[PDB]
Design a protein around this ligand. Structure first.
Ligand SMILES: C[C@H]1CC[C@@H](N)CN1c1ncnc2[nH]c(Cl)c(-c3cccc(C#N)c3)c12
Ligand SMILES: C[C@H]1CC[C@@H](N)CN1c1ncnc2[nH]c(Cl)c(-c3cccc(C#N)c3)c12
Lengths: 289, 288
């Protein structure tokens, strides 16, 4: 699962303080270093010798090979008595969903700053051939230093593992059409799917819910496949500037061939504005207390 | 399937010999006890904690097919931990079994085969089905020189895989439209069968599909490049311009420009006047 794993009980180094919740899979615990007192988040997953180790192997590999200020910090992993423990940064404010349900709608400048920081994390991930595939407020954390960090590579790991399995059982390819060979090797979609999720997340930070949240999940999926499909928009026009409406319009470009990349989005009017600094986030954290 | 017979298939058929299956299972040559007709019985072993989704999709595809160019379905039996799918037996086996003894097929024999496969393909696509495994091994020839498509194994596996995507997709509110589209539809369409028929036409002509001596992973990688050139027949002088054009048109790299099976039925190669089962009866005489 990981050549750098510690075959030791994490409870030798950490006091488990409380079960904070969970992600796509696993259970997350708040933990404290026994001697220093430093806080960490320990994600525990059941790991038997018979289980497929590929998903968790890929999640650890993404966390270990990410060296970025906009990606949650990784400290190491533990394997002890059929339980895998992934040790990561403990972000004191929690997720942006934890924040906006107490604080309400973020201001346009706070959203602009979060979007820029997320786009820097996405530009980095995409440059290293990775796709997050689960961009949303619940997966964007704010640490005590006011930094915006992408978290939960669970879906990304599951998708990488599913793609490796498909290649293993693809069979003889001599009669396969090139587009069949392409979805077997790449998947049918690309990293631009993360740009659309950031557009939906910016609406979620403004409205406390993604668009169509009240609509049945299957109806949402079917409508996206229909011919006359129109992407979502911000509900209250006058509350937001034209730069925010345009950010939603371009990130939510229906065709992936015309959806801008993460680096191209960094020069967009909304995220290239002058007043975007960590002070906006430190002031968001002050409102929480 | 609700119409599954809960009896031993040996009550109605005499098992004659094991022949080996396709994608999955084992196929037995068998004889109908009342008519003396041969049938192919596909046997799949069962275990109590087995996912029955793929098997269920294969039976449903076969039970709803009613076309001369697709193996006929005669029912399925569940007995003593085994599932038996009963289908049409084709006396000469597959085109691969034939050309391995006979050698290369003539252009007119290939044109008859292509027309018959396109009739089956046009039918399958009209019913919203995809074969996905068109090749010499899956095109059977009966004693009368007639053509039947066989082995909906890959087709059933893909269908089962796609149904399992719709079940474990999770909340879709942050999901881009193209991600939603591949989860429901798959990322490719029925036009993949047109390409496979082009490669199959080359396989019948040259005894191997193009790049057969190149590593499978290298072939897969080459195809994804934006400079990949579709294959062509090696001996230009051995074939007519119409066959060379059929190959170029079926092997259109872009699935947006690749013609449908119904469109291909109007192509010169397969709409020619002398195409009939007699051409395959000549092939079978060469075998004996
Ligand atoms: C416990 C989780 C989920 C519930 C959320 N309300 C708060 N959250 C965190 N809070 C404080 N520090 C944290 N560090 C990390 Cl990593 C997470 C985190 C957040 C989201 C997904 C995953 C995973 N896979 C981990 C975290
Ligand atoms: C026994 C099989 C496999 C080996 C091949 N050499 C000859 N072949 C047939 N030959 C004569 N009639 C047949 N009818 C049917 Cl159906 C098949 C068939 C062919 C291929 C796959 C499957 C399945 N699932 C069934 C068949």
């Amino acid at each position: 699962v990981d050549p750098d794993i510690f075959n030791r009980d994490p409870r030798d180094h950490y006091d488990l303080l409380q079960r904070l919740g969970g992600g796509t899979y696993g259970e997350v615990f708040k933990a404290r270093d026994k001697v220093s007192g430093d806080l960490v988040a320990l994600k525990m997953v059941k790991m038997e010798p018979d289980d497929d180790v590929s998903t968790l192997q890929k999640e650890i590999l993404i966390l270990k090979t990410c060296r970025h200020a906009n990606i949650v910090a990784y400290h190491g992993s533990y394997l002890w008595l059929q339980k895998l423990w992934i040790c990561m940064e403990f972000c004191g404010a929690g997720s942006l969903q934890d924040i906006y349900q107490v604080t309400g709608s973020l201001s346009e400048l706070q959203i602009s700053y979060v979007c820029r920081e997320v786009l820097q994390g996405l530009a980095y991930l995409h440059s290293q051939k990775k796709i997050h595939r689960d961009i949303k407020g619940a997966n964007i954390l704010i640490n005590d230093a006011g930094e915006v960090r992408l978290a939960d590579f669970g879906i990304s790991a599951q998708i990488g593992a599913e793609l490796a399995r498909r290649l293993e059982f693809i069979g003889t390819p001599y009669w396969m059409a090139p587009e069949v060979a392409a979805v077997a090797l790449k998947g049918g979609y690309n990293e631009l799917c993360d740009i659309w999720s950031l557009g939906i997340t910016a609406i979620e930070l403004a409205e406390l819910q993604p668009p169509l949240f009240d609509v049945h999940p299957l109806r949402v999926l079917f409508l996206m496949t229909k011919s006359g499909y129109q992407p979502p928009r911000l509900k209250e026009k006058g509350k937001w500037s034209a730069a925010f409406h345009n950010f939603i319009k371009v990130t939510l470009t229906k065709s992936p061939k015309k959806r801008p990349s993460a680096t191209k989005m960094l020069s967009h009017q909304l995220v290239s504005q002058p007043g975007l600094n960590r002070g906006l986030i430190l002031d968001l954290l002050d409102k929480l207390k």
